């Protein structure tokens, strides 16, 4: 069918049927409190850490899907229904969900009653605000009852779903006025509680799940809603919930407005209690009063909109392609904010249990986020560096709540350290803030082991240097960027994840992808050395880079494309000589980005091979042919059925590297073709195949070897967002931050007449108009700034708060 | 107030309405393959280990409750319903579930069609057999379609519920004939697969959940059933299922019969494949062949029943109280088999994730199981001892699948080791098989560290001696039998379980409970020293016991009851001096069982104090008064709200110790009264309050301090079963295995005229008739065996396969 459309003017995606191919979600919040909310108001929220401070409960992989969230019920003379269609699933006269930037509006109408709810998390506020408008659009007087409902989680989501032998006896609440407080374990080690409030006198409430719903009933028909009145239950263990009810009368045409808030509160220990066994509510009262009127809410809603408008205005594209404009000025940037906050932790696929902030994942997210909020990016870099060990390796991820590095999803990923150099460079190029290099940063999360940020950089670089294999290529260790390339593993026990099973310290298996990264990213470390006035170190660094290049050229090129790796037996991986996995995509991207084989045609050959063997209607697959059996020497990658995930699935993330590479060899047309094939705005009419959100990138699309080819998994949380924004904004469009200022160097489809990019950069804004009068793909003939022509492709830095005219002539 | 009834003749509990106060379950299997099944056919099955080999998926704490299991849908000309009512939940003309010994029989009737399903796991067979009978009891010919349904779990239940990121792309199945095979990850490290067969030609099938059910539908209305035909779906990732459909025609009065089997198969590494990508089904064919006619199914069913009759016949009571008869002769012994197999791993409360086989838990379960299958008992002891460390401490639990000890739920519980001595002694008293003391048993799961079972006991014993505190009482460590008495903890971080959070090797905190246990249990260690011919080691051990008995009297008695412990600061726990927790139950029980203070009125006074401060209509609470705030010096016990779990909850398990203790001071009337307050058969007429299974014991009943006083939690899996069986069968009824033979020493209510116990013991049967002409509580005046008066209270050992009549006159 048609499920919705883009609304550029209001910066929203509009969903017009509730039964989408899969629940389609949005994220609320940008700082500390977060929510996931689907087009039926399903989902949940949490504070900073989805595993350790989960506020509301949510069941993944449920039947039916996506049962649980913020459930308003309208009771009308025995009949009842919800604005989001689900959970009651009675036909609505009209339905609509608008996902916007930091908010979601869901509107439903049945039997003359229209209900419209705006969900959002205000700036600098630890709660999800919900403005509910109820209008009688019929001709008669209506007496109805409005019910609210959330189901609480017992804070620790893992304990919550396994430790019933204990936690069925720990649930505690307080009810006072129009507020329901969840205070489980507050009597002991917890200094925080949650509340659910409405800003009107209530007719009733419920806080015990069994009482409100009934043991053998579902969310579709809670016995209390069916009977048209709350039961005023007080929870005592089992399953605490929060539900208000409000009896309401409405004349024809009359509307009434309500503000519901799901809040989080942490008390100082000297302010924990009001009296014995009675929680100190001082801070709740403040939060609640802060939004006790619809007009206070509107003001915050508009403050949020202006906030987004500001962020987005830092890179503004005016072109003749509306789909492109929509990706660049809105959605890609929006998704980059989300991934920056969430990393890979919590979505409708990532369970918010096992994954925290990923080391390499968050470093890469920085690439597409640094320009939006440099301050927060700066601090993020410092937080990631602190989880680096003294030997230069790093904890593969850290706990969001504490920021402590941990090994819960494995260790010894030899590509990890390099990402820190790339992200630091990106931040420096964007800001000119070299002072970050001087910051004192813990090692191993140990303040007593601190050294400068630059010394962290030095140990990242040299972790590769000190860990090379028989070909002078970088040892792969447990895996590189590809988590599933496990060459030191040889596991036969079904019960341990490949990510954490023992992996030997093999000195044979090497990665050609890490080798490419090293050359590409090394460029940046050399310059940073030079800045630090360390000429000899810069020289030695450059030597190691030069030797790595020769190693790739000598032992890393297969003939028509770059190899992937060498396994523990010294056998090639990703060569024409293999039976399966003859060619992999990862090394093609980075080796060419590193500018290898530009002169002898090896790069062009590689990219042509990629096109030939890896290209599909839905994007470039990871490798070809797919593995058709388990290879004990390759690890997890061969455990997936053909075409799914790392086994010949389409990993959109690494498609960005090929886009970048095509730009290196000056083929703007092909680069843009690759970009178009996976960009949401261009593939919207196939939602029934893609299945997932049409307004955001996903991690994985089933490849040509899969029966479900074209079906996506794991939407929203993917490095595809950061890397595709970099590709399109810097490599194609050519507005590329550098140490000395803005480097202009587009590579576009020849047919393009031109476009305009408005770019805020280092304290002043640049209006850049690009003209392609000879219709070339790459190469700049003339640049003039403020009327005068300049020499070079590097715009000067003004920092004068003014707008500067820039004309760029392709030639 | 009643939702069923006991059927003694058929050894069943009959449930007559589907909406019980909580789902009421039964367990199938006694060897390797196990199922949990509720009164509506909810639940799941697994092989050996509910975490590592879970076959079918099940959602705990679900809404609605208990959705998912073995779901037959009868489709009748557009109407559809289920034999167990749930999940369709359309009204039935009749409904009935009988929970029997190792089978569950469920029967529904709607619109003239009756369906009856019998579920059981046959002896020596790795599958759940489901015999289904359909009958037309109406006047006209009927055309109907029968659907079957199970949802597969992805083997590893933890992964299954957390790792969608990956496991939505691994699901795989094969369909061949009338059989659906689930083979996820069989292509890689798993040598096992599951199947779902029916012994008849089918009309269609489904193996993809989304196809059978439909994204936005529930188990209540699968789109395929609504539609009256299978979609013939072949799973590919997402959520594999198994469903058959069969079009059936029934004349009036006609009945058809089908046999469905949920099977588990393991192949040798070299025999996994029939051909490339096609699984070796040879073993499945054999399993399916084995029960392809109702005739074969009925024969195994009767063999199971013979198995159970023989097990139960070894201890058989005849008395004037039929509630006591059914407890002793059927339900208590049935529960002891279940706990022996399952420890505390998997029920509707224990999630089958975090807990394997508990060290302390499985040792206690043996007490109530040795008479049933000594051979299996003997082996269980060796497995347990293998998880003991060389210093005498033990892993707190071990993985069912591999039997390796682990620390998943904490370490350094100083009561642990002693339970091994008790259980070994119990085994020997039962069998007279001292050979077990000479078995070579590993330490730390390490064969190279092996040594005799006796040496293991020696280290258990000396672990206490080598770990005493300032008063000569045993250092408590992380905790004693009470997992929540954590005195070396001082925890402030809410994110980690008290069970696993760091706990110092404290040298001050002491347990009077472990002291009591050490005296009581140490008596057996002395007896075994003597048997090993080590009179001097027996002397030394007796010294330590006598020294401990002095320490208890000098520092463990508060004046009117025994103290509980000393905290890390040297302060008394469970003393009149304390503000809360002035008296604890645990130390009263073991100290009196240890025979401390029988002569000076201390024992009796303690027991009277127990009656006065801990007694309730629902059993004895853990301590009094309850803790009304968190005591950081006490740990987890004060984290529960008052009246629940270890904070003044009624822990039925420790009530048995009070029952035994009452028996020791000769108060049989009090002992039996306590026994009756918690025995399922005696409170059946208060099912609504108790809430859980009315036919088995539960771990915990909310205490007088709780608003839910009387409501149980954590049914089925609890040491309450073994300890209460021991209490009634041995300490009250007086039939007590001893080293040299059966000891007869009843302590009963004075009013009883007598009773008869038929006991099978060391190769002979004894018919013991007890007579009470003077109406005493305790004291045997005369015994005759085979018509001849014997002296003393120990029956001779015959081992002659004959029946010997024994008459006991109390006086």
UniProtKB/TrEMBL annotation, chains A, B:
Residues 11-290 form the Glycosyl hydrolase 94 supersandwich domain. This is Cellobiose phosphorylase. It comes from the Bacteria. Pfam families: GH94_b-supersand (PF06165), Glyco_hydro_65C (PF03633), Glyco_hydro_94 (PF17167). InterPro entries: 6-hairpin_glycosidase_sf, 6hp_glycosidase-like_sf, Gal_mutarotase_sf_dom, GH65_N, GH94_catalytic, GH94_Enzymes, GH94N_CBP, Glyco_hydro_65_C. Keywords: Glycosyltransferase, Transferase. GO terms for molecular function: carbohydrate binding; cellobiose phosphorylase activity. It comes from Acetivibrio thermocellus (Hungateiclostridium thermocellum). The gene is cbp. Its EC number is 2.4.1.20. Residues 307-734 form the Glycosyl hydrolase 94 catalytic domain. The lineage of its organism: Bacteria, Bacillati, Bacillota, Clostridia, Eubacteriales. One of its GO terms (biological process) is carbohydrate metabolic process. The keyword Glycosyltransferase applies. SMART domains: CBM_X (SM01068).
């Amino acid at each position: 069918m048609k499920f919705g459309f883009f609304d550029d003017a209001n910066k929203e995606y509009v969903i017009t049927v509730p039964r989408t191919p899969y629940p389609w979600i949005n994220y609320l919040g940008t700082e500390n409190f977060f929510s996931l909310i689907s087009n039926t108001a399903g989902g949940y929220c949490f504070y900073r850490d989805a595993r350790l401070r989960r506020i509301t409960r949510y069941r993944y992989n449920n039947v039916p899907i996506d049962m649980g969230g913020r459930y308003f019920y309208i009771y009308d003379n025995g009949d009842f229904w919800s604005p989001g269609w689900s959970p009651v699933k009675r036909e609505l006269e009209s339905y609509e969900c608008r996902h916007g930037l930091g908010y979601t509006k869901i509107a439903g109408k049945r039997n003359g009653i229209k209900a419209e709810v705006t969900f959002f998390v205000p700036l600098n506020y630890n709660g999800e605000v919900q403005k509910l408008i109820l209008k009688n659009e019929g001709q008669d007087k209506k007496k109805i009852t409005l019910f609210s409902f959330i189901e609480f989680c017992l804070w620790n989501a893992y304990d919550d779903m396994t430790n019933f032998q204990r936690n069925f006896s720990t649930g505690e609440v307080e009810i006072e006025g129009s507020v329901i407080y969840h205070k489980t374990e507050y009597r002991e080690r917890r200094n925080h509680y949650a509340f659910y409030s409405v800003n009107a006198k209530i007719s009733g409430f419920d806080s015990d799940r069994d009482s409100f719903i009934g043991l053998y009933n579902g969310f579709d028909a809670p016995q209390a809603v069916v009977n048209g009145k709350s039961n005023n239950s007080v929870a005592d263990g089992w399953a605490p919930i929060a539900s208000h009810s409000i009896e309401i009368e409405l004349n024809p045409g009359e509307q009434k407005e309500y503000v519901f808030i799901i809040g989080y509160v942490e008390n100082k220990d000297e302010e924990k209690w009001e009296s014995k066994g009675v929680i100190n509510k001082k801070k709740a009262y403040e939060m609640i009063e802060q939004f006790n009127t619809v007009e206070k809410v509107d003001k915050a809603f508009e403050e949020l909109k202006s906030y987004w408008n500001a962020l987005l205005s830092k890179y503004f594209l005016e072109s003749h392609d509306e789909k492109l404009n929509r990706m660049v000025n809105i959605w890609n940037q929006y998704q980059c904010m989300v991934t920056f906050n969430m990393s890979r932790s919590a979505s409708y696929f990532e369970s918010g249990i096992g994954r925290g902030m990923g080391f390499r994942d968050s470093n890469q997210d920085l690439l597409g986020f640094v320009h939006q909020i440099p301050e927060r990016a700066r601090e993020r870099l410092l937080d990631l560096a602190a989880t680096q060990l003294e030997d230069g390796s790093a904890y593969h991820q850290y706990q969001p709540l504490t920021k402590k590095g941990n090994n819960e999803i494995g260790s010894n990923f030899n590509d990890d350290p390099l990402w820190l150099i790339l992200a630091t460079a990106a931040y420096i190029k964007e800001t000119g803030d070299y002072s970050i290099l001087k910051e004192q940063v813990p090692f191993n999360n140990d303040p007593s082991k601190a050294d400068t940020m630059f010394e962290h950089l030095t140990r990242s670089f040299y972790h590769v240097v000190n860990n090379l294999g028989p070909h002078g290529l970088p040892l792969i260790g447990r895996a590189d960027w590809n988590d599933c390339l496990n060459l030191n593993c040889f596991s036969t026990v079904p019960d341990e994840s490949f990510q954490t099973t023992t992996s030997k310290d093999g000195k044979v298996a090497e990665s050609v992808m890490i080798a490419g990264m090293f050359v590409f990213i090394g460029k940046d470390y050399v310059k940073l050395c030079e800045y630090m006035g360390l000429e000899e170190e810069a020289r030695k660094a450059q030597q190691h880079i030069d030797a790595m290049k020769e190693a790739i050229l000598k032992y890393g090129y297969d003939g028509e494309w770059f190899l992937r790796a060498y396994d523990d037996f010294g056998r090639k991986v990703g060569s024409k000589e293999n039976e399966e996995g003859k060619i992999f995509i990862e090394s093609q991207g980075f080796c060419v980005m590193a500018e290898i084989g530009l002169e002898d045609g090896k790069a062009l050959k590689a990219l042509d091979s990629v096109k030939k063997y890896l290209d599909t209607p839905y994007g470039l697959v990871l490798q070809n042919p797919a593995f058709t059996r388990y290879y004990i020497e390759y690890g997890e990658i061969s455990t997936y059925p053909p075409g799914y995930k790392e086994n010949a699935g389409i990993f959109c993330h690494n498609n960005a590297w090929i886009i970048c590479a095509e730009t290196v060899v000056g083929r703007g047309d092909m680069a843009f073709d690759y970009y178009r094939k996976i960009a949401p705005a261009y593939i919207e009419d196939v939602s029934d195949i893609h299945k997932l959100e049409p307004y955001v990138y996903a991690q994985m699309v089933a490849g040509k070897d899969a029966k479900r080819h074209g079906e996506a998994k794991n939407s929203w949380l993917t490095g595809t967002a950061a890397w595709n924004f970099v590709a399109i904004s810097q490599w194609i469009l050519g507005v590329k931050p550098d140490y000395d200022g803005l480097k202009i160097d587009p590579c576009i489809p020849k047919a393009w007449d031109g476009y305009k990019v408005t770019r805020y950069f280092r304290g002043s804004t640049y209006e850049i108009t690009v003209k392609n009068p000879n219709h070339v793909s790459k190469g700049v003939a003339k640049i003039t700034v403020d009327g005068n022509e300049i020499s070079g492709n590097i715009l000067p830095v003004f920092n004068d708060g003014k707008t500067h005219k820039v004309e760029v002539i392709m030639g």
